[PDB]
Structure formats: C-alpha cells, structure tokens
Design a protein around this ligand. Structure first.
Ligand SMILES: CCCCCCCCCCCCCC(=O)SCCNC(=O)CCNC(=O)[C@H](O)C(C)(C)COP(=O)(O)OP(=O)(O)OC[C@H]1O[C@@H](n2cnc3c(N)ncnc32)[C@H](O)[C@@H]1OP(=O)(O)O
Ligand SMILES: Cc1nn(C)c(C)c1N(C(F)F)S(=O)(=O)c1c(Cl)cc(CCCC2CCNCC2)cc1Cl
Length: 392
C-alpha cells in the first residue's frame, strides 16, 4: 500500500476558497466556553440521526473538549462557517492528529470528525468545500493523509464493521423505541433475558489509575499490533484517552478498568468504554438514551494465540464491562465487530444492529481490511485481525 499522490508544499494555497454568499470561514477556539457551546448547539440539533428520525447523537460539551483537544491538537483544524450578519455558526468540520499503522507502515494522519451542516443549508454542495478547506489546513501543517469513519457508503471504504447492542435497561430502551417487544413475549421476560450479575467476576479488577499508564501503554500497543489497521498510541494518548480526570472534567466521558493480577500485581488486562447519549426526538416519557460504547481493551491471554482461551478471558472481562456500565446507569452497551469482538458479542447477548460503520483513508491506498464480519454481515472469528482502531 502507500500514498496516492505527493503534495507539493510550495503550491499549497495560503488563502481559502470562496463560500456561499453571506457566509464566512471561522476558526473555532474550543478553549473558549462560548465557542464550545456554539459547536454543541450546532451538533445537538443538526448532527447524525437514524433513518427513522427517532434519535440524534448528543455529544456532550465534556466529550467535545475530550475528542477535540487531544495530544497534538491545533485550533486551525477546528473549522467553522459563520453567517456574516448574525455571526451564527452554521457548519463544522474538525480534525485531531494521530499516527496509525496500516499493514506495518506507520503514517502521520488527521482523524476527521464532526462534519456537520445546518439543516437549512443542506444539499448545497457545501460539504466538498468544507472538506477541501480542512484538507488545505492540514497540508499547510505537513499532514497529507486522513482516516475517518461514517455510517454511509462513500468511495473506496477500507473496511466495514457492524454495530451490536447489549441492553442494560431493557424497559427504558423499549419505551424509547430502541428495542422491540418480540412478540410472544413480555416485559418481565425481556428483563430476565437481559439480567446481569450485581458484582464483577474478574479477580483484581479495579478502575484505571495514572500509575497504570506505562503498563497499559505497553499491553495496548502489543495487543493492537495484532491488527492490520491500528492506532499507534503514544504515552500522552494513553493518558488522554483512557484516564478520566475528575478534578478538571465534571461530566465523565471515559471509563477505564484494569486487572491487577492477584499474585504478581502486573496489569494483565484492561478495558474501557465512553459515554455518548442520543436525544430521543419525540417521546413523552424520555428525552435521552445513555449509551456506553466499548472503546479500547487488551489482555495478555491474546499472546498465546489460543482462541478458546482468548474467548473465555473476553467473555469474563466483557461481562464485567457490562456490569460496570449498568452500575454507572447506562441504558445500552454498544460495540462493533472490530478487534476480537466477534468472540463474545452474541454469547454476551448483544443484538445485531442495523447500523454499519465504514472506515476510510484519504490519500492512502491499501488492500481491503477484514472488519469482523462475513459476506452475510454476521460476526465471524475468521475475519478478525483487521480493524484495531476505534473512532468516536
Ligand atoms: C490530508 C487531510 C485530509 C482531510 C479530509 C479527509 C476527508 C474527510 C471527509 C469527511 C469525513 C467526515 C466524517 C464524519 O463526520 S461522518 C458524519 C457526518 N455528519 C452527519 O451525518 C451529520 C448530519 N448530516 C449533515 O450534516 C450533512 O447531511 C452532511 C454534512 C453529512 C453533508 O451535507 P449535505 O447533505 O448538505 O451534502 P452536500 O450537498 O454539501 O454535499 C454532497 C456531497 O457530500 C458527500 N457526503 C455526504 N455525507 C458525507 C460524509 N458523511 N462524509 C464525507 N462526504 C459526505 C456526498 O457524498 C456528496 O459527494 P459528491 O456528490 O460530490 O460525490
Ligand atoms: C440510539 C441512536 N442514536 N442514533 C443517532 C442512532 C443512529 C441510534 N441508533 C438507532 F439505530 F437506534 S444505533 O443503532 O445505535 C446506530 C445506528 Cl442505527 C447507526 C450508526 C451509524 C453512525 C455513524 C456515525 C458516524 C460518525 N461517528 C459516530 C458514528 C450508529 C449507531 Cl450507534
């Protein structure tokens, strides 16, 4: 694989292209509360919906602060469009830098996310203009490749993974139209099907601490190396993405847990999950669904290449993840078919979803990467080893 074209730094424009009449480019400063609020107001009413217009992602201000001011971030890559007259923010497209491994070639990239246009400005071909602008800002900073994810099919995806969903509060999910009552069944029966133990079972399990950063960093990198496409984590990215800072972050977004071996006290495993609510668009009974999404994890068990032993360790670790997410009042636990997730999703009672997540690279070509599913879009233990990165 490799880059499609080389960018001539000499020819990157110092000026942006023109915009629809009445609008202008604006760099966002997300360390300004007013501007974080304005981005949150845009996304909360205009970001991704489902096909039935029942739900809309509701990224919190805390999540936005976390997702967008990660190690290495530059305000130049938080791009807005404003109305010249009202000053209203009406469109956004954002990036943060990271390094990825693509079949053992390490690449410096931007991860692109939070592309959004106000409903009133849709279907005016503003997207290509937003894309071309952030591309120009990245080129000016010596970044020439990008990775991104979308729930829609666009030119040359690198992989595709299917969403899976583990009900934690089945009755809330039913009430908001997320989960069906099938059908010869009852509420009490679906609750039973979904019941979880009150307490975790992995010996040594505890919340991740700052002291664990180096050991978790080593285990995660070793683990992620078993994937064709992966995130090449730095120590600062371990600290930022996995260790919640309660002194400075009032609405927790990341949960991470480690397994401190009872005998050796070396961390032998870990997992994590993030908080992403959806607003429930029109429901007398509820206005939100509080989803937890499985994030990164690792286990020393993987290195045996004994798949039955990996499966058993993951069944235990992941059921503990479910227990902990329910304790922290999440309604549903979401995961994709990436990493080794096909090993546990169905047995731990995750239901197959209608959503898919497609992975894309800009200005980089590589063979299709397996995303955890067969041709029928079902989880397949022979289709793993491919996607090792979780985008937000
Ligand atoms: C080196 C650095 C490189 C940096 C850049 C790397 C590329 C980054 C790429 C972006 C990664 C984003 C990652 C995320 O954030 S994925 C989530 C994106 N956001 C949403 O879904 C929010 C709800 N929807 C909207 O706000 C709008 O409907 C959007 C903004 C999505 C399009 O607004 P609109 O509906 O008014 O359309 P248009 O008339 O302006 O333009 C039509 C064109 O736009 C292409 N389109 C539609 N959806 C997407 C999409 N999700 N990715 C890329 N392209 C998309 C479409 O095929 C058509 O192309 P074509 O007909 O010309 O072929
Ligand atoms: C509860 C919910 N909120 N939203 C906005 C959506 C689409 C849902 N769902 C709905 F189907 F119930 S869902 O099944 O959990 C779901 C569905 Cl259907 C579809 C998708 C694809 C979303 C792709 C975006 C692209 C940007 N990065 C975050 C993911 C994700 C999810 Cl999480």
């Amino acid at each position: 694989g490799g880059p499609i074209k080389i960018i001539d730094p000499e020819k990157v424009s110092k000026e942006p292209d023109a915009l629809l009449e009445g609008f202008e480019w604006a760099t966002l400063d997300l360390t300004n509360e007013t501007e974080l609020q304005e981005l949150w107001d845009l996304l909360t009413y205009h970001y991704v919906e489902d096909d039935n217009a029942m739900f809309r992602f509701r990224y919190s201000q805390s999540f936005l602060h976390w997702a967008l001011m990660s190690p290495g971030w530059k305000k130049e890559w938080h791009v807005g469009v404003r109305a010249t007259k009202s000053r209203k923010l009406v469109a956004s497209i954002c990036g943060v830098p990271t390094e990825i491994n693509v079949r053992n070639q390490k690449l410096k990239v931007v991860e692109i996310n939070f592309l959004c246009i106000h409903k009133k400005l849709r279907s005016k071909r503003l997207t290509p203009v937003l894309i071309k602008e952030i591309t120009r800002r990245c080129y000016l900073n010596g970044i020439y490749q990008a990775i991104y994810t979308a729930g829609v099919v666009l030119p040359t995806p690198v992989s595709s993974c299917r969403y899976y969903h583990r009900p934690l509060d089945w009755l809330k999910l039913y009430e908001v139209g997320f989960s069906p009552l099938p059908a010869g069944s009852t509420k009490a029966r679906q609750i039973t099907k979904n019941h979880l133990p009150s307490t975790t079972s992995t010996p040594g399990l505890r919340p991740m601490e700052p002291k664990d950063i180096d050991t978790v960093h080593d285990l995660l990198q070793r683990y992620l190396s078993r994937f064709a496409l992966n995130q090449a984590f730095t120590r600062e990215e371990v600290d930022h993405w996995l260790v919640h800072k309660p002194e400075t972050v009032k609405e927790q977004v990341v949960w991470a847990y480690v397994v401190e071996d009872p005998e050796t006290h070396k961390i032998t495993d870990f997992f994590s999950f993030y908080n992403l609510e959806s607003t429930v668009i029109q429901n007398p009974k509820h206005d939100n669904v509080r989803a937890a999404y499985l994030y990164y994890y690792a286990t020393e068990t993987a290195f045996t290449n004994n798949m039955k032993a990996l499966k058993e360790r993951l069944l235990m670790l992941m059921n503990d993840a479910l227990i902990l997410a329910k304790k922290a009042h999440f309604d549903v636990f979401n995961a994709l078919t990436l990493h080794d997730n096909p090993l546990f999703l169905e047995q731990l009672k995750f239901g197959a979803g209608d959503g898919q997540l497609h992975f894309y690279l800009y200005n980089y070509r590589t063979a299709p990467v397996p995303g955890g599913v067969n041709e029928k879009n079902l989880p397949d233990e022979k289709r793993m080893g491919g996607v090792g990165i979780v985008m937000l």
